[PDB]
């Protein structure tokens, strides 16, 4: 079912270990806020927060498509004012959702707003949103694992692999 | 110096979760196992647990606030005929757990069990059956590894007791 | 697109003023719980038709597959432990979105539960108390009811034609 | 304990404003979308829509607080390329309405204005209001959709204390 392993568990964990310090050094009297959209990046944000050597807090959101604009099924539980926000994504490509999210959050008057992603694809050029932190640059091929799914499966994989068309 | 004593090291937690996964994996062998977690104390635990379980598992989240209790974000899929494992972080009063268990059973899943990381002594009063317990601990307010005090100390890798000054 | 009208404003509003009478007799304040949004137009006129002090509690609902599972989008703002609860619905077919709610509300343990519809249909699983109109298994739109979103603002209820 | 606006005054005004909006929205196959916030203005919407001749469109939203507010219930449909009328119960001090504006125009509607029933005097805030039903004074008032600790909504008239 998994054709090939794009990134092993140890490779992923070593990269996040690097990201943690890089993020930590930049944000080094309130805690850094990690904001994640359910649920492709829960494994990533749980590892990333532990990798960040400065105190960090969690906030989750749940959105849905309308069928560039998304429906909010679950909003933030806290006001964002004067807080350093770090949006945490799993995969960014033709992601207009991220574009919408950055605008929706900056309207709430954060003190800062950056974006960190584990995976970036070549089609992320067509998105209007800056990304300060990128784990890996991968091809456009459909990958699953480490939070990434295909019909809600393969999320529990600890590595990132490529699907065979089945 | 916010933490007085350390209760459970990162090694103890990791080693325990590896055992649970094995135990859970052996008990669940014929769809996929369904892990349901209520936001957001048991997010770190459920991300580490799923990876420890040697059978295919899926994630499902439910955000909920108190008034018995209010639903802010229901499940993203019907759980009819599914083997459901409720994943909690800490149980003592267990009033919310008791409701959640009843609310899920009324959706008629094939199987329903509960797995918690910590269990405090006051959990003997609540009439909820728990199939898997990571650790039994005294009746002290602990923090770390998902657990919070005013949204802080969740990103800690270990579990400790909070100093009286805080 | 209404082929013909069988129920109009004067006929509906009068019955709704008659429904409130029965409710006033049979019934601190009364809670009207309604599912958005095909029955919103009916509740609003019902509360004013009831002499005793009533109240509103709204509840948004989506769905999964079909056969009677229900996803919750909003749900009540308050608890209803031991209180006057009257479910207000718009249409009742062989659909069990109604008692899923009553079961969902019974579990919260109110004092009294009672349902109430404007228009019932030849299909019936719960204690349906106060029935407004008994209509055949035909098309129904108007007065809150809809077909893809529209025909809600109508003061009457007409029949669509396929 | 007081009477500000009679049920006759309220019902007569709504009909006259339904006339105001009925002939100002008359090219597009879409309808006028009535977007409102629970749970105060929910009685106005039912009477306002029937007062408006052109086919209209109900849409609701639930909002909590922390003008910073939180969405508990969102819109079912996207309002892109749509004529939207925001209907509010009472407009006073809260930047709740200004937020709803800056939030809905980001959905890029074809047109966006607001129709409120009552109007407090300090509602000179943000985004000016297209249509007004009654210019009320600066006093806490209930009745007709308005409430105090969840009540007096069943009233068909508007009265103080
Ligand atoms: N599993 C997986 N999901 C992806 C990948 N790239 C983007 N996604 C996410 O999965 C979605 C696929 O659904 P669609 O693009 O058809 O709406 C994307 O919109 C994005 O949210 C990927 O490489 N693997
Ligand atoms: N962080 C932390 N949370 C706890 C502990 N014991 C109970 N809780 C959680 O705290 C909540 C109840 O506390 P309350 O909000 O009523 O003071 C429940 O969500 C419960 O699971 C604990 O020892 N540490
Ligand atoms: N508007 C309208 N709704 C109906 C009628 N009969 C039943 N309903 C309700 O509306 C649902 C149909 O909406 P749909 O599932 O097509 O979005 C039914 O499952 C039932 O809950 C009717 O005659 N007219
Ligand atoms: N009944 C009534 N409610 C009002 C009036 N003005 C504002 N409100 C509502 O009462 C709420 C009071 O909370 P606030 O936002 O003022 O802290 C407002 O947000 C608004 O929803 C009024 O004149 N009469
Ligand atoms: Mg994503
Ligand atoms: Mg996906
Ligand atoms: Mg919990
Ligand atoms: Mg907590
Ligand atoms: Mg209905
Ligand atoms: Mg309908
Ligand atoms: Mg208001
Ligand atoms: Mg109020």
Q: Which chains touch C (3 or more CB pairs under 8 A)?
A: B, D
Neighbours of chain A (3+ CB pairs under 8 A): B, D
DSSP state of B86: E
d(CA A14, CA A9): 9
| Cα separation, C70 vs B103, whole angstroms | 12
From the list B78, B102, B103, the residue facing C64 with the nearest CB is B78
Cβ of A91 less than 6 Å from ligand 1: yes
Phi, psi of A159 (to 5 degrees): -115, 170
Strand order across the beta sheet in which B111-119 lies: B69-73, B57-66, B33-38, B83-91, B111-119, B132-136
Q: Distance between CA D47 and CA D41 in Å, rounded?
A: 10
* Closest by CA position to B148, among listed A82, A19, A78: A78
Pairwise CA distance, residues B49 & A74, whole Å: 24
What range defines the domain where residue B36 resides? 1-166
Which C-chain residues 23-52 have CB contacts (< 8 A) with chain D? 29, 36-37, 40-41, 44-45, 47-48, 50
Closest CB to A42 among B59, B152, B155: B59
Closest-CA distance, A146 to chain D, in angstroms, reads: 30
How many Cα atoms occupy the beta-carbon half-sphere of D17 within 13 Å?
Answer: 22
Packing angle of the helix pair B10-27, B43-52 (nearest 10 deg): 60
Query: Is residue D9 helix, strand or coil?
Result: helix
- A118 contacts A89 by C-beta, under 8 angstroms: yes
The reply to whether omega before B36 is within 30° of 0 (cis) is no
Give percent helix, percent strand, percent coil of chain D, each to the nearest 5.
20, 30, 45
Q: For residue A156, indicate whether it is catalytic.
A: no
Tell me how far apart the alpha carbons of residues A34 and A116 are, in angstroms, rounded to a whole number. Answer: 10
Rounded to an integer, what distance in angstroms lies between the CA atom of residue B165 and that of residue B67? 29
Residue D12 to residue D14: CA distance in whole angstroms: 6
- What's the DSSP call for residue D92? S
Residue whose CA is closest, atom 11 of ligand 2?
A: B93
CB A15 within 8 A of CB A120: no
What is the distance between the alpha carbons of residues B105 and B9, in angstroms, rounded to a whole number? 35
CA neighbor of C70 nearest in space, from C43, C38, C103: C103
Helix, strand or coil, per DSSP, at residue D75: coil
**Angle ∠(D64,D66,D72) on CA atoms, nearest 5:** 25
d(CA C132, CA C141): 16
Q: What tokens were used for B104?
A: 């899920």
Question: What is the four-CA torsion angle of D114, D120, D121, D124, rounded to 10 degrees?
Answer: -30
Distance from CA of C9 to the nearest CA of B (A): 37
Cis? peptide before D56, omega within 30° of 0: no
Domain count for chain B, please give it. 1
DSSP state letter for B79: -
How far does the CA of residue D63 sit from the closest CA of chain C (Å)? 10
- C-alpha separations of B62 from A62, A79, B40, C126, D53 in Å: 10, 21, 9, 29, 43
**Peptide bond preceding D39 in cis form (omega within 30 of 0):** yes
Please name which of C35, C30, C127, C28 lies closest in space to residue C90, comparing C-alpha atoms.
C35
Q: Which of A2, A69, A148, A151 to mutate to test the pocket of ligand 1 (most atoms within 8 A of CB)?
A: A148
Breaks (C-N over 2.5 A) in chain B follow: 30, 67
| Range A93-96, long-range pairs (CB < 8 A, 24+ positions) | A93/A120, A93/A121, A93/A122, A93/A123, A93/A124, A93/A127, A93/A140, A94/A123, A94/A124, A94/A126, A94/A127, A95/A124, A95/A127, A95/A129, A96/A68, A96/A127
The SS3 assignment for D109 reads coil
Cβ contact B107:B80 at 8 Å: yes
Per-residue CA distances from B98 to B63, B68, B79, B105, B133 (Å): 16, 10, 18, 11, 16
Structure token digits, residue D97: 């309405």
Contact (Cβ atoms closer than 8 angstroms) between residue D135 and residue D151: no
A104: exposed, middle or buried (C-beta count within 10 Å: 0-12, 13-18, 19+)? middle
C141: which DSSP letter? B
Measured distance CA(D86)–CA(A152) in Å, rounded: 38
B135 vs B117: CA distance, rounded Å: 6
CA distance A14 to A36: 21
Strand boundaries in B49-110, DSSP class E: 57-66, 69-73, 83-91
Q: Where are the beta strands (DSSP E) in chain D?
A: 32-37, 56-65, 69-73, 83-91, 111-119, 131-134, 141-142, 159-160
Q: Are B146 and B44 in contact (CB under 8 A)?
A: yes
- Ligand 2 pocket, B60 CB below 6 A? no
Whether residues D74 and A69 touch (CB distance < 8 A) is answered with no
Identify the chains in contact with B, defined as 3+ C-beta pairs within 8 A. Answer: A, C
**Where does C6-143 have alpha helices with state H?**
9-26, 40-47, 98-106
The residues facing C156 across adjacent strands are none
Backbone angles phi, psi at A120, to 5 degrees: -125, 135
For the beta carbon of residue D108, count every other beta carbon within 10 angstroms: 14
User: How far is residue D130 from each of residues D111, D113, D136, measured CA to CA in Å?
Assistant: 12, 6, 16
Contact between B52 and B18 (Cβ < 8 Å): yes
* CA-based end-to-end distance of chain C: 9
Strand partners for A160: A7
Beta-carbon separation of D71 and A66 below 8 A:
no
> Residue A56, Cα to own-chain centre: how many angstroms?
15
Backbone φ and ψ of A137, nearest 5°: -100, 115
A19 CB-near residues (< 8 Å, 6+ apart) = A48, A51, A116, A133, A135
How far is C-alpha C50 from the geometric centre of its chain's CA atoms? 15
| DSSP letter assigned to residue A129 | -
> Which method, experimentally, gave rise to this model?
X-ray
Residues B64 and B96: beta-carbon distance below 8 Å:
yes
* Residue pointed to by tokens 């007569």: D12
Outline where DSSP puts E strands in C22-82.
31-35, 56-59, 61-63, 70-72
Q: Determine the distance separating the centroid of ligand 12 and the alpha carbon of C85, expressed in angstroms.
A: 21
Specify the residue for token string 């805030």: D125
C71–B74 C-beta distance less than 8 A? yes
Tell me the C-alpha distance between C12 and B38, whole Å.
45
Torsion of CA B119, B124, B129, B130, to 10 degrees: 10
Tell me if D158 sits within 8 A of D146, measured CB to CB: yes
Which pairs with CB-CB distance under 8 Å and at least 24 residues apart come from D113-116?
D113/D85, D113/D86, D114/D85, D114/D86, D114/D87, D114/D88, D115/D17, D115/D21, D115/D48, D115/D85, D115/D86, D115/D87, D115/D88, D116/D87, D116/D88, D116/D89, D116/D90, D116/D91
Q: ∠B113-B118-B123 over CA atoms, to 5°? A: 75
Ligand nearest to the CA of B151: 8
Contact D35, D84 (CB under 8 A): yes
Token pair for C145? 């009811």
Interaxial angle between packed helices D44-51 and C40-47, expressed in degrees from 0 to 180 and rounded to the nearest 10: 110
Instruction: State the smallest CA–CA distance between residue D96 and chain A in angstroms.
Output: 13
D70·A76 Cβ contact <8 A: yes
B chain contacts of residue C76, beta-carbon cutoff 8 Å: 70
Could you tell me the distance, in angstroms and rounded to a whole number, from the CA of residue B147 to the centre of ligand 2?
A: 8
Cα C32 from Cα C47, distance rounded (Å)? 8
| Cβ(A43)–Cβ(A16) below 8 Å | no
- C-beta of residue A62 within 8 angstroms of C-beta of residue A122: no
Question: Where residue B41 sits, what CATH number does that domain have?
Answer: 3.40.50.2020
Instruction: Provide DSSP, A39-90.
Output: TTTHHHHHHHHHH-SS-EEEEEEEEEE----EEEEE--SS--TT-EEEEEEE
| Resolution to 1 decimal place, in Å | 2.8
CB pair distance less than 8 Å for B154 and A74: no
C-alpha separations of A66 from C63, D39, D78, D80 in Å: 15, 24, 7, 11
D144: left (phi over 0), alpha (psi -120 to 50) or beta: left
Instruction: Quote the CA–CA distance of C37 and C74 in Å, as a whole number.
Output: 12
Three-state DSSP class for B106? coil
CA-wise closest residue to D73 among A101, A103, A64: A64
**DSSP symbol at B14:** H
* Atom nearest to C146 CA in ligand 3: 1
Tokens of C101: 């709610």
| Among protein residues, the one whose CA lies closest to atom 19 of ligand 3 | C95
Whose structure tokens read 């009068």?
Answer: C14
């Amino acid at each position: 079912d998994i054709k090939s392993v794009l990134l092993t568990a140890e490779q992923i964990q070593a990269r996040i270990a690097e990201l943690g310090e890089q993020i930590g050094n930049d944000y080094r009297g309130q805690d850094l806020l990690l904001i994640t959209v359910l649920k492709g990046a829960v494994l990533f944000v749980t590892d990333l927060a532990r990798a960040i050597p400065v105190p960090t807090q969690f906030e989750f959101m749940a959105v849905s498509s309308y069928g560039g604009v998304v429906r909010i099924l679950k909003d933030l539980d806290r006001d964002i004012h004067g807080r350093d926000v770090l949006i945490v994504e799993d995969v960014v490509d033709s992601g207009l959702t991220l574009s919408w999210l950055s605008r929706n959050l900056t309207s709430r008057n954060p003190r800062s707003l950056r974006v960190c992603t584990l995976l970036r694809k070549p089609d992320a050029v067509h998105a209007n949103v800056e990304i300060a932190y990128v784990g890996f640059d991968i091809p456009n091929d459909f990958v699953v694992g480490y939070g990434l799914d295909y019909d809600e499966r393969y999320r529990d994989l600890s590595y990132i692999g490529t699907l065979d068309p089945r």
